[PDB]
Nucleic acid binder design. Sequence first.
RNA 1: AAAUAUGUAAGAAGUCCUUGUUACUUAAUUGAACGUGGACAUUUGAAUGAAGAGCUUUUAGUGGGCCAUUUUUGGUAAGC
RNA 2: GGAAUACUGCCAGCUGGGACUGAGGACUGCGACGUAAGUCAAGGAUGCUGGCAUAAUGGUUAUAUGCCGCCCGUCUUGAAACACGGACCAAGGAGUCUAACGUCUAUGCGAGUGUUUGGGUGUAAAACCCAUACGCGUAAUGAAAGUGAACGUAGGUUGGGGCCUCGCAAGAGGUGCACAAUCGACCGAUCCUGAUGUCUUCGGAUGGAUUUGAGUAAGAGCAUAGCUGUUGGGACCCGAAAG
RNA 3: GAAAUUGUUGAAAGGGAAGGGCAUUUGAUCAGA
Lengths: 51, 155, 148, 185, 53, 222
Amino acid sequence: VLKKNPLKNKQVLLRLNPYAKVFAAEKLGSKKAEKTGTKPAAVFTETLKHD
Amino acid sequence: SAQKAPKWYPSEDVAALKKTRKAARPQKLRASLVPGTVLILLAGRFRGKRVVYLKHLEDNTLLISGPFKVNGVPLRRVNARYVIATSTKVSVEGVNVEKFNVEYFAKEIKAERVEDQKVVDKALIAEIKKTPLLKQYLSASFSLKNGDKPHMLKF
Amino acid sequence: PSRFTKTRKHRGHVSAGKGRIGKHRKHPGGRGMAGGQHHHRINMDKYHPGYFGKVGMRYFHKQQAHFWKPVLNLDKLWTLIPEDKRDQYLKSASKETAPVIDTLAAGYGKILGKGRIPNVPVIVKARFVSKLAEEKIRAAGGVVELIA
Amino acid sequence: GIDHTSKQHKRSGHRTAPKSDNVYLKLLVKLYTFLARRTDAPFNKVVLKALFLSKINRPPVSVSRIARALKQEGAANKTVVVVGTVTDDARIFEFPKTTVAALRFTAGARAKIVKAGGECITLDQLAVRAPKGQNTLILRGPRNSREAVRHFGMGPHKGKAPRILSTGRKFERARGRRRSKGFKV
Amino acid sequence: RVKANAAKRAEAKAQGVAVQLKRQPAQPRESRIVSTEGNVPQTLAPVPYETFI
Amino acid sequence: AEQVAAERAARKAANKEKRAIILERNAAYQKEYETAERNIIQAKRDAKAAGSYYVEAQHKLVFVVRIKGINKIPPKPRKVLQLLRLTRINSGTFVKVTKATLELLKLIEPYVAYGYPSYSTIRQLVYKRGFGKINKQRVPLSDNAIIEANLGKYGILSIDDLIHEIITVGPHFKQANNFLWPFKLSNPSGGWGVPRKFKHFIQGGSFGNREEFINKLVKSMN
RNA sequence: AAAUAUGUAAGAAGUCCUUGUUACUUAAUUGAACGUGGACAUUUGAAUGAAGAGCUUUUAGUGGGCCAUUUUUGGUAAGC
RNA sequence: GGAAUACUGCCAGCUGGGACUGAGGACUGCGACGUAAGUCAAGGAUGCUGGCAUAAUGGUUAUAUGCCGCCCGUCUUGAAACACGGACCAAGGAGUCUAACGUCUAUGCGAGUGUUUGGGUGUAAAACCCAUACGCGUAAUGAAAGUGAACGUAGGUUGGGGCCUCGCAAGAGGUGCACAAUCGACCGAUCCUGAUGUCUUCGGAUGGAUUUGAGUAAGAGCAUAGCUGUUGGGACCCGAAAG
RNA sequence: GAAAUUGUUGAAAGGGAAGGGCAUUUGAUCAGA
Ligand SMILES: [K+]
Ligand SMILES: [Mg+2]
Ligand SMILES: [Mg+2]
Ligand SMILES: [Mg+2]
Ligand SMILES: [Mg+2]
Ligand SMILES: [Mg+2]
Ligand SMILES: [Mg+2]
Ligand SMILES: [Mg+2]
Ligand SMILES: [Mg+2]
Ligand SMILES: [Mg+2]
Ligand SMILES: [Mg+2]
Ligand SMILES: [Mg+2]
Ligand SMILES: [Mg+2]
Ligand SMILES: [Mg+2]
Ligand SMILES: [Mg+2]
Ligand SMILES: [Mg+2]
Ligand SMILES: [Mg+2]
Ligand SMILES: [Mg+2]
Ligand SMILES: [Mg+2]
Ligand SMILES: [Mg+2]
């Protein structure tokens, strides 16, 4: 009789999408990225700063 | 026959309501309403009176006292949406407000209410008297002056 | 019944369903069959080809009774026999005692041969007969007797 | 505003009830409405639709047509269903024994069927005998055989029976109907 | 295409299970890595106006 | 001799099995999305480190919103809009990008704003304004049972299965996208960001390809 | 020699294999047309859409038009 | 060299204030929490409290204020028009009936149908009953003389609802009315061919054809009634100058 | 014993028309529980 919006009404958000509980518990919307340290090539930097 | 009565008549049976999913969960009153806080009454016969906040009641009303001896406002219920909670606090450790509940205020002046007024006021005035001109503050009525801007004012 | 007509429904509408631009005038295209060759030529030629002109030869003082000749096809040939007797005539398909059918007395002038008849002899008295009608009547073991 | 891709509020264009006020026909329609809703029987649905049809959409079905349908291979024992009138035909001389369910029977048609040794039942008797239309054979008369039909689509080179009151020589046969008078059609 | 489709269907039902017999519109390009070895990007600029008449 | 408990318990158990299947499928989808996004990021970084340029794949999915009213539309753009189911202002649909659909977007450019929808945008669109076509009956996607009943023959068991089939343009994208009723969006809540909508986005207007800013526009319209 | 516009096709009424009819056709069972029998349904052979598709009857009003962008003719031009 | 921050984007992160709405009316569903019982924000508002108990709310009406609002009808591409009719009011005032019809629909009967010209009868213009005819239909075609509708399971092919068999089903097969397309067959007309025979000029078998018919190919019509449309009628109403 | 039109009484409004729509004030009036 009445459309209840998920993205609010956590109850409906959980009726659909049982994975929302896991998402919220593990904080997958704030996932930390593994650190890497690849550096752009000198040719990339020189082209980028080329006038 | 003046109207030729209808072929079908509606049922004169009131239907039961379907089950309501609305539980009565406790009110969350704003963090500024801590017992002992000096409130300013915004409406009622004691509008503008500064009173002392006390136990939060079950009908969601705030139990307040003047103290009656200080400004003539007795122990009474008040609506939280009709008070401004100032940032002025007295200590209500020592006042016994467990007695006052919704049934206490159900509808000349009762001697029981006079004696509860005396006991609560005697517990409150002693705490008030160690803050200079707090008794005078509570005796004075609040009013907005020319240029007072309640969206900018702090209380 | 006037209460069911659309003129009751046009009450209050000025043009009575006849339009504001082209009104209901008296005789905008002529009366009756006017202009069938000039301004109704399309409607004459479509839906009435052959309307204008002469197509054959005349016949002064034609009497239709001279040409009265109702046709009965062979496919009936038995509704002229009474219903009760028809069953016992269909049974016992004998060359003797074959039922006699007066088609003229039944009101027909020519017997045609459209349908097919059961293989039972029948004596058919007619004024005229189709060739195939007589052939089928004879193949059923019957005969055609000409009368007038 | 909506850019409508089709006519709004368009009626389906099909009858949902008979135009007839025959109370017995309405009772038959009620019975077959129940059946079509609660049997999942294509037969019941098509019979319910046929019960709505106007007279020219229910052309009579003759006992000759029934006999030919029964001469169909394997149909000899099927119950013939005609949603309409069953008429008599003297052009046949050997009618088979069969069960025919029809809205109406001509006196002669009923007589021929019963004399051949069958039964003429109504559509509610048919519904009781075969609620799912078991072993039925729905026959329909020759719709495009009406006299009115031969005038439909009249025009040049159509060959479609001009609308005329008197027939014969001198009646719409000269100019536009032969090459000797102007042209032919 | 009919003949190639018959041949592909036959070879498919002989070799395994895959058909893919419907043509497809030109698809969006896939990712690619573009090298600069011998292809260092040249920088262009808009040219000033002149008449050359 | 009860035929009530031995049905309700079995139906609850079947519902639990279906929910566990949906849970594991959604977890797999989340892993897929995160891995693809981090692989794109890493490919770009690796190409830069190797002195190359990672040319990301062309976008396979667009979201198109009709921003023009229904009056005074030339017939060919009007027909293309009707074939993209954009028969009303602020109606939106997903279009799988091919040559055949790019040449439709080209025709209807002055009447639509379109671009490349993000997973967040698609998810919010389907969650809030998702409706399915069932006897066409514009049924809200309030439960996964409806999605299973109408798209389960394509392996789509939930609203997240549907979102997945949309974002990754799957083998049954046509059926899932057509099952999705055209999204009826509101006007943007902070405005269009431009004084006049009916010049191209490049020229300071609203229509045409706004490739990644379609997410902000649609989020403000949703 | 464009752009725009425009014809056709994108399959089961299809494709392949064998062989029956003929007074047509061939030097000729040569071919033509129509068939019999046999094989091939996940994508039955691009995309998108499809308040469905097809069909019929019968009748109303209308048959003064005008305007805007663009193409364009006469005219100096015109709210021509 | 190590950070920060901006910008952009994501979160099924948390949370405050404001507005509109409360449709539905036993249960049924999907969920959530809970160990389970049960509980819940989960297929649409309930709980607590106050005043009033009547002109207080509300309705009506006049007026005031804010904003808006040209005179209707008509012809017209275009009317508020410096286009026409209208000073006002009452009453009257314009698509009717009929003969014959088209389509559609309802009804009765159905290869038939129509009792009502007339007769019988009557409680007397009613109702009831009826013979022979006649009309239309059941045969067409040709100018006419005239001739006149089954090779066949009243045909073949394709599609075809429904039904039948098999199958859990999907589907496959059989039968396929209506209807559609097409190729045939039959009847009449036209053009040819011209057998037995013979009043030797009649007869016209048999076989044909880029020809033709408003035809046949297991009949649908007849009657009554209704809307709409048609024609003649004063003919929707009023109107000439004339004869 | 209608209306047009008119007298009297009562009420109300009125700076170059009047009439009308939405909303509310004010006055008058009134049904419903
Ligand atoms: K006219
Ligand atoms: Mg709703
Ligand atoms: Mg009108
Ligand atoms: Mg007029
Ligand atoms: Mg704003
Ligand atoms: Mg703007
Ligand atoms: Mg005119
Ligand atoms: Mg930010
Ligand atoms: Mg009021
Ligand atoms: Mg104004
Ligand atoms: Mg003019
Ligand atoms: Mg006007
Ligand atoms: Mg003027
Ligand atoms: Mg005039
Ligand atoms: Mg005047
Ligand atoms: Mg009057
Ligand atoms: Mg006169
Ligand atoms: Mg004269
Ligand atoms: Mg008097
Ligand atoms: Mg008066």
